[PDB]
Amino acid sequence: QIITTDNTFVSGNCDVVIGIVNNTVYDPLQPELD
Amino acid sequence: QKLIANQFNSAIGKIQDSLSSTASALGKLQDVVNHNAQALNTLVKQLSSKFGAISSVLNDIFSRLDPPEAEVQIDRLITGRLQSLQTYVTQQLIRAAEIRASANLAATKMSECVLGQSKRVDFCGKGYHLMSFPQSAPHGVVFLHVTYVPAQEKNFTTAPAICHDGKAHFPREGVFVSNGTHWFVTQRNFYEPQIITTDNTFVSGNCDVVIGIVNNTVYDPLQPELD
Amino acid sequence: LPVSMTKTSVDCTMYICGDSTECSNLLLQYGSFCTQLKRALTGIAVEQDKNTQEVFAQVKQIYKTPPIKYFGGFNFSQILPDPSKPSKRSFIEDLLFNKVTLFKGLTVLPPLLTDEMIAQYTSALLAGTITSGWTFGAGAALQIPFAMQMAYRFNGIGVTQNVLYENQKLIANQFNSAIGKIQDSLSSTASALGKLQDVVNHNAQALNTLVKQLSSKFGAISSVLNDIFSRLDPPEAEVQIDRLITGRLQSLQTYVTQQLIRAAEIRASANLAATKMSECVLGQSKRVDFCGKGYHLMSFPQSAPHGVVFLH
Amino acid sequence: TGSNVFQTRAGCLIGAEYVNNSYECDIPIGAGICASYQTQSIIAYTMSLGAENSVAYSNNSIAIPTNFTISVTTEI
């Protein structure tokens, strides 16, 4: 499944995790533009 | 909270009354005591057995027999009493093995139910286990298992998924119930109907593959914010 | 898993004197050995009955399967009771019963629960698990479609329930194929039911060796009491009779001790069987390798002549 | 005594009257036969395994509890 804010949670910046990778996370509300 | 507390207090009082009144509620320790008493009694009772000798009193056979003849009867008595003691020791060993198994079970139950919340069906009493309390007994342990028993069940018609916008929606942590003509999402172990929304449902695939899927609307909390 | 063993009763007087008027009086001098042996054997028999009750009487109500036996493609014909056979046993139950097969003062007492009642208990458990999942084992039995119950059990193993709904037909076909293959596995295997047959063989062998030792002289002139009492005077016959009596009493005591040890083993097995029933049939177990190899979905009990068979 | 005689798989039972209806097992005899004292005389009967009920299974029916009763039970 696509990576989105619904199926992922944030914890801190990404300089503390070993093996972290750069990729995009889609926000379902972004295209809605309520 | 108040209803649950009242139920717990009533259950504790009922346990108290049942223990006070029930005739043979504590048979699993009375049995151990009776077995020990019976074993000791038979051990002492076997002491009076003649074992083929003229008499079971050693002074009697000493007095009424010469040493050459008294020796055989004393040997018979010695063998009989030694065999009785051997049998007593073997039976005690078997009973000790049984009691060790019981004690291991008791320790496991203490750990799982008292020091935690066991998910095993019947390990900490009937029903869904909440917690347990240990109580000392003369030769054992008494566990009071607090459990959650569902009651007052009502029948509803259900569907495995909801088809909305040509997509199959499944309940994230609940079940779909229809209330005759209005579909809701409710938790399995308690009736708490809620409107079907995108928050409490997840979507996977179209409605052509799921058997028994039903048509209903899924409310989007962000829909009202049209401006 | 074996659950119970044969309930044996012995008449010590007959076994030792073989129904002879002479040494029956002499045996009285040895005390309360007969009472000890009788009490031990009665305790073993009551323990067997308790084991059966604990294993199979875990359900309070005799749930009945509905007449329209459609469960979303799943086919429980091989495990549900047959309608026409007088025993009302299931196909696998019939096969299990067919696969294992089997005075001088020794007799066998029948169990309190007959095979028909154990089959009734198995049918009640099967109906409860098929029609209500885990609910009947924790309170009021709540009906639920079998597809939804299997979807719930999928969630218990970390698989989203959608995986089942999109693959219901394949899962049902796999279940049916496995159930069918169970029959072949049980029939073809020469030792599939080895444990229950081992229990039966141990009981039969113990009884046979107990009977055989009556012929042993134990150092006496002969193993027949009538012979000694016929041609030997009481002063010389008494010693020979005592020699026979001590040996026969020792043999009986050895039999009782071995029976007690084997009954402890059977009690351990029955406790394991009861735990398996409670944790796999009445619910779903997260314990690894406790209800079969793999992620446990559900289990079905089947009656056996001296045990239980779990279809994990 | 010979007042009443009944044949059972466990043996011959004398002094008990067989009744054509089942109860819970009070005194176990064997082969499913149990004896009890009921209005008074000793009776023999086939033990009852429990109440029989049929779950209302259906393709689209589910039952959900609307209440609960938290209970405490004793184990020794």
Ligand SMILES: *[C@@H]1O[C@H](CO)[C@@H](O[C@@H]2O[C@H](CO)[C@@H](O)[C@H](O)[C@H]2NC(C)=O)[C@H](O)[C@H]1NC(C)=O
């Ligand atoms: C998952 O495994 C099952 C079982 O092997 C596959 O089902 C079989 O698929 C083949 C090829 O289509 C058929 O010939 C068999 O008859 C199927 N067996 C059954 C019991 O239906 C299934 O195709 C596999 N799925 C995937 C995605 O690989």
Ligand SMILES: *[C@@H]1O[C@H](CO)[C@@H](O)[C@H](O)[C@H]1NC(C)=O
């Ligand atoms: C990830 O992206 C950030 C910002 O563009 C960049 O500073 C960083 O070096 C990138 N890391 C990797 C491993 O590409």
Ligand SMILES: *[C@@H]1O[C@H](CO)[C@@H](O)[C@H](O)[C@H]1NC(C)=O
């Ligand atoms: C189902 O519930 C309805 C009312 O909600 C009732 O009339 C009917 O008897 C119930 N059926 C069963 C099988 O419980």
Ligand SMILES: *[C@@H]1O[C@H](CO)[C@@H](O)[C@H](O)[C@H]1NC(C)=O
């Ligand atoms: C549930 O059903 C009853 C009768 O079918 C109906 O009156 C009621 O409005 C329904 N519930 C809701 C929230 O509408």
Ligand SMILES: *[C@@H]1O[C@H](CO)[C@@H](O)[C@H](O)[C@H]1NC(C)=O
């Ligand atoms: C089973 O129930 C579902 C949901 O109500 C329905 O869509 C389906 O047609 C039913 N199937 C049968 C065979 O009645």
Ligand SMILES: *[C@@H]1O[C@H](CO)[C@@H](O)[C@H](O)[C@H]1NC(C)=O
């Ligand atoms: C559900 O609604 C769609 C149109 O929105 C229709 O094509 C489909 O047939 C409906 N399904 C049922 C079971 O009525």
Ligand SMILES: *[C@@H]1O[C@H](CO)[C@@H](O)[C@H](O)[C@H]1NC(C)=O
């Ligand atoms: C269930 O399986 C048995 C054995 O394979 C078969 O005889 C029977 O027809 C099947 N039942 C259904 C409803 O398919």
Ligand SMILES: *[C@@H]1O[C@H](CO)[C@@H](O)[C@H](O)[C@H]1NC(C)=O
């Ligand atoms: C018990 O009832 C059945 C059914 O009515 C009958 O066939 C049988 O003869 C009865 N037996 C006795 C002993 O009354």
